[PDB]
Amino acid sequence: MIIPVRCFTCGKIVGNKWEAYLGLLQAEYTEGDALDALGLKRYCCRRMLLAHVDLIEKLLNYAPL
Amino acid sequence: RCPDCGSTELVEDSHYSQSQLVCSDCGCVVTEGV
Amino acid sequence: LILTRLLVPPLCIRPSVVSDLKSGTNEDDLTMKLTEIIFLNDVIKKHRI
Amino acid sequence: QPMIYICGECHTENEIKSRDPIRCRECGYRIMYKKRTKRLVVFDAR
Amino acid sequence: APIPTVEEKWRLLPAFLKVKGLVKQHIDSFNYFINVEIKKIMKANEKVTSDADPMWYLKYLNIYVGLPDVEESFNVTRPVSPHECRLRDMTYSAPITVDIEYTRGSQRIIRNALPIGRMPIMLRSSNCVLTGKTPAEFAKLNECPLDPGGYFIVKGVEKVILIQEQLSKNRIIVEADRKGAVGASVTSSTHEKKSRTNMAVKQGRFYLRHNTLSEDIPIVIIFKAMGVESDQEIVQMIGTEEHVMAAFGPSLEECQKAQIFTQMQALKYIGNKVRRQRMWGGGPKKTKIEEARELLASTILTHVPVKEFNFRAKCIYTAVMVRRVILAQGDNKVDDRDYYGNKRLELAGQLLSLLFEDLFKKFNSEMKKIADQVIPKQRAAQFDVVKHMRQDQITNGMVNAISTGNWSLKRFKMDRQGVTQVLSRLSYISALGMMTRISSQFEKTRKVSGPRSLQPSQWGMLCPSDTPEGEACGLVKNLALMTHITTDMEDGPIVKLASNLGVEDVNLLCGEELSYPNVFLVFLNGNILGVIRDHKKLVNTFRLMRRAGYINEFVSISTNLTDRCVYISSDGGRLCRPYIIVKKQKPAVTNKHMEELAQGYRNFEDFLHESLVEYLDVNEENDCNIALYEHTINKDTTHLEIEPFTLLGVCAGLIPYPHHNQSPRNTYQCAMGKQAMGTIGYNQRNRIDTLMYLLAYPQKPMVKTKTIELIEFEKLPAGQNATVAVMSYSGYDIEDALVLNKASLDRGFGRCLVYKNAKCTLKRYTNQTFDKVMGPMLDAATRKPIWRHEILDADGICSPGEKVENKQVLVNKSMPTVTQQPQYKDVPITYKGATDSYIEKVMISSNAEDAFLIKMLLRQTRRPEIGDKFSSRHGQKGVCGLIVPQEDMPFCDSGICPDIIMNPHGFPSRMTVGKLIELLAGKAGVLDGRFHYGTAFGGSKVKDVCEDLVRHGYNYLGKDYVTSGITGEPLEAYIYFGPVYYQKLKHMVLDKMHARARGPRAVLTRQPTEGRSRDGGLRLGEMERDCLIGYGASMLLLERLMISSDAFEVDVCGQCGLLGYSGWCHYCKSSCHVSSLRIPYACKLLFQELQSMNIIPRLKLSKYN
RNA sequence: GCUCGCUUCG
C-alpha cells in the first residue's frame, strides 16, 4: 500500500527516501545508480525500495474525497 | 428472582459460548444451557 | 409380525425447530410420514363410509 | 437528535430521521455510510 | 551452421492475449449466447397456440436483453454498477423484453416493448457496463481495472460457472466389458434425444442392445430389417477378410437358424421385442411393425439421418461398427476414454442456452394451459396473454439455477450439481486461477484413478502441475496460458468442399469397398461422409484451403491409419492451440514479421490470415510433427512451438524456475498460491466481503516470470521479499519449520489485516409492523451506556472507529412477536470473537421491500506469531517455530541479519534446486538493481548471476562469511544468504485455535456440536476408540465416551424390561421394580428408536456384585 | 437450529 518507514532486516530509515527515488526515476537515473546515490550500500534497502509497489495512489483514486 | 439471595438482578451473561442467566449479586447460576 | 398399531416415538427423537423468521416450522421426516399415514387411514375410513 | 450520514458519491452530510427512505439530495444514490465517531480511541504502536 | 532463431518469437504470445486468452472464453461465450443463440431459441419457439378455440396464436417477433438495470425505483429503471449490486445484496441482471403480436378477439394486437424476464449479466460482457471503460471510469464505478470479470453477481454473491468436460457425442467407442468382452457403444445425441446403443459379442455373435428393446437381438436381423436382405451384401459390408468372415460366421448361422429372411419378418421379430412406454395414449391399431420401423429409423442411431426411410447410411454405419469390433477382437487396440481428443468443453454459453430454452418452453406451456383454461368459458371479455404473462418465472429460474448451482432439465433429463461456485477472493491469483478451472464429468465420489492420471494429450491445452491437492486430485484442472476453445460452425462449406474433392457417395457403392486397404472412410461429426482414395491429397488440400481462409480455421481434420478413417471435426468445445507453420525446415515466421508486429504493422489475425500461424486440435496434432525449438526442426516437421513456458497455467506461472523443482512441489505451490494472502484490487477498500485478507506492505517479487508480467501480478503482489538464510538455528526448525526475526516483525514484516462482515436486516412483515433499532440502554446510575451497549451510537448502530470486544452488540435489533399493541423482543447482533476488532465502515442500504440492510466491516490487525503458516513460492510450506531477537540472529560482515531462517534438510528429500536458483538470481538482482526472470524452460542462467555476484564483490555462490550472533564467534561453514519471496497464507493459529468447555449440546443427541463457529468439541472417532482399546485403558475410554460426552440416568423397570420415567413404569402401572441406571444418551435414543421399529429391547438388570 | 453442496486444511 505505502512505503514502510523501517527496513525489515536492518532498520534503516527508508520511508523518507521514496519520493526522492521517484525523482531519480523522473530523472535519467537507472535503478542501480539511483539506489547507489541514495546511500543504500547493503542490498536489503535496495530490495526494499526496488521491490516496493506504490499502491497508495491507486487506492486514493477510489477514496471518497 | 435469585433462589439463594432473593435478589432480582438476573442478567443473561454468556461465558464462552454458554448461555447463562445468572444473578448479578451473588453469582448464583439460575439457568444455563440452551 | 403383522402390524395393526404404529408406535409414534416421543418428541425427543423428532426435534422441531421454531423458525420465527418465517411462517413455518422445521420438522423431521418421521413426523411427515406419520402425518401421511394418519391422512391415509382417514381417507380409507372415508371411502369405506 | 440530528443523525448524520454520508452519501456514496456526493459525500455530503445528510440528516435523516427514523423510518425514512434511504436517499440523498441532488442525486439518487442509495448507499449511505455512517460518519466516524467523535469518541477518543487509544491505539498501541506495537 | 546452426539454424537461425527468431528471438522475438515470444512476442506472439501477448498479441494472442489481446483478443483471446485467460478470461475471454466465458466472455465470448456469453456474448454469443445473448446475441445469437437467444435469437435462435426464440425463433425455434416463435409461435405458440392452443388446440381449443383455433385461429388464436401468440407470435414472438424479436427479443432484447438491454442494459443492466435495477427495479428498486417505483416502476422506473435505473443504471446500477456491479459494485452497487455487491453492496445491496441484489442481482446484476438486465430486463429480457420481447415484441409480440397476438389476437385478443380475432383482432391483431401488437406490443413493441413488453418485459418477460431478467437475465443475469456476466461482468465485462457486451451488455455489461464495465466494458469499453477506462481505468478512471472504473474508479468512478468502484471497480478494479485489473479485475478479470466473467462472473455473475446474484444477491450480492459472485458465482462462476466452471467449464464442464464431457465425452464427445456421436462417436463409436470400442471397450472391454466387466467380463472381458470387447464390445462397442455409440451415444447418438441429436438436439432432441440422446440414445446410447451398444453391441456385444457375449456368445461369439453380435447382439445389439438398446433401452427401447426388451431383449438384445442379433445384428443380422437388424440388417435384414433395415432394407438389405441378402446375406452376401451384409458380409461384403462387414468385410472381406478371412478372419472377419470366420468371426461373423456364427451370427449368420444363428440368423439362418430362425426363419427370418425378409424385411417384414425381421420387423415383426423386432416389434415382438418392443414394449409399450406404459400404455401410450392413443389407439395402436397394429403399430407393431410400424413401431419397429420407427425405432429403427428415429430412435436407433439418431445422429445417422435417413432421408425417407432409407437405412443405407445406417446400414453402412453399423457395418463399419461391426468391422471395428471384429478388428478389435484380435489385437487389443481398445480405445481409451482419457484421450482428450474425444473430450468436449461446455462453457457457460451452452449451459445458459439450454437453460433458457427449457425455461422458455415451460413458459410457453404454462401460457398455453392458461389459454386453454380461460378462453372457452370465461366471458365475452376476450382473453389476452398480456394479463397472464408472469415475468417472475424466467427471472426466478435463472436466479435459482445460478445461485444454488443445481440444474434440472426435464426436457433433456439432465440432473447436474456444482455447476456454479462461489468466486474465491483470497487474492488476485486465486480468482484468476479459479476463472479458468475445468471440472470433470466423473464428479468425484469414488476412487476411479483412471481419469486422475496425467495424459499426454493435455500438452499445451491444460496445465500439468496445477491441480487441487486432495480428493479432487486430477479431476479439477486448469487451462494452459495459451489455449482456445472452439465454437460451432455452419458445416455447409465443409460438406461442399468434401463433395467437390472427389469423395464418392456411400450409397453409390457396396460395403465391399470398405474392406479395401487403400480406401479411407471420411467422417463428419460422427456421420459417415463417404469414402476416398489417396487421403494424403485430400488432407493436404483441406489444410491448404483452411489456411487460405475459405474454410474456418477451427475446423479440424485428422487421419487414423489403424482404422483408416479421416475424421473432420467442426463441433464446438474442442481445444485448439496456435502453432507456427513449418515448410521445408524453415518456419514461416521470420524476424521481419516479428518486427512488424512489434511496430504495430500487423496483429495476430494477420499471422492467421497469411498462413503463418494456425490452430491445431488434439486430433489434428496427433498426426502433425511439432518442434519445441528451432534447433530441433528436422526434415519431417510440420509445426513449431511458439513458447514452451505456455505449457504451464496461470497459478503455475508464479513458480520461479519451475523446471528445476519436483512436480509435487509445483502442485503444492499452486495450491498454496491459490490461498496466498495479498491485495485483491484497487477497489479493495470499498469492497465489503464476508472475509478478506490484506497485506500491510506487499512487494513485487525480484525473480518474476514472464507470465507474471502478462497477468499483471506485479501490480497486485501477494507476498514480501525477505533476506532468508538457509541454515539450522536453535533446533526450532526441525521439520519444515522456520525461525522469524523479532525485529523484522516489529518493523512491519508480515503484518496482515483481516476484514470481516457483519450484516443485519430490518424487514417489513405482512402486518404493518417493522423491525426497529432501539437506542443505547443508558445506565441510570452513571448516565452512560452499559458495557454491552457502549459502542452503540445514538441510533442504536455501532459507529466506525471504535474497538469491539467479545459479546458486544453492533446493532440493537428488536423484532415484533405478533408477526393489540406490538410486543418487541430483542435479538441484537452480538460480536463473537476471541480478539478485539475495529469497525472501519458501516453501510446502510434500503431495498425495494423496505428492508434496511446494515453491513459493518470489522478490521483486525495481526502480527506474525508462533503458528502462522508461511510459504516460499516453492511448495515449502512452513510454520513459525520460534521468534528470536535481532541480536540472537547471525550477522554477516555488512551487518545484515536474516528475517527468515529455513531448514536445509528440506532440500535433499524434495530436490528444490529452483529455490536456490531463485535465491541467487534475486541476490544478483538486488545487488545490480535488476529483475531477473525465472521463466519456465529458460530465464537467467546461473553463470550470469554468478558474474553479477563476483562483479559486486560478493561470493559467486551466495555463501558468505557469517559470525554467530550468540557466541560472537565465526561459523565453521558459510551460510547461504539471499532475498526470497515468501508469501503468508490465510491459515492462522488464532483462527484455528479452539477450546471447548461443557458448552451446548445437540437437541436430538445430547452431544457437543461439530464446528468451531458452532462452538463444538472434538470427536473421538472409531480409530481413536480402537487405539484406546489396544492400550487397554477401559476406565479412560468409559470416561471419554460415556461420562464426559452423553452421560444420563434413566429408569428401567426390572419386571418388563422397559424404560420408565421419574421412577415409574407406565407399562406395568407400578414403581417397585423401577431402578435407576447410568447410560449414554445415544444408547437410550437407539433403544427408543428400536422400540419405534417394533424391535423391543428388554433389559434384564442385576446387581453389580 | 436440521439438511445438502462447494471449498480448503494435514
Ligand SMILES: Nc1ncnc2c1ncn2[C@@H]1O[C@H](COP(=O)(O)OP(=O)(O)OP(=O)(O)O)C[C@H]1O
Ligand atoms: N486423506 C488423508 N488421510 C489421512 N491423512 C492425511 C490425508 N491427507 C493428508 N494427511 C496427513 O498428511 C500427511 C501426508 O503427507 P505426505 O504425503 O507424507 O507428504 P507430501 O504431502 O507428499 O509432501 P511432499 O509432496 O512429499 O513435499 C500424512 C497424513 O497424516
Ligand SMILES: [Zn+2]
Ligand atoms: Zn535495509
Ligand SMILES: [Zn+2]
Ligand atoms: Zn449524494
Ligand SMILES: [Zn+2]
Ligand atoms: Zn414394568
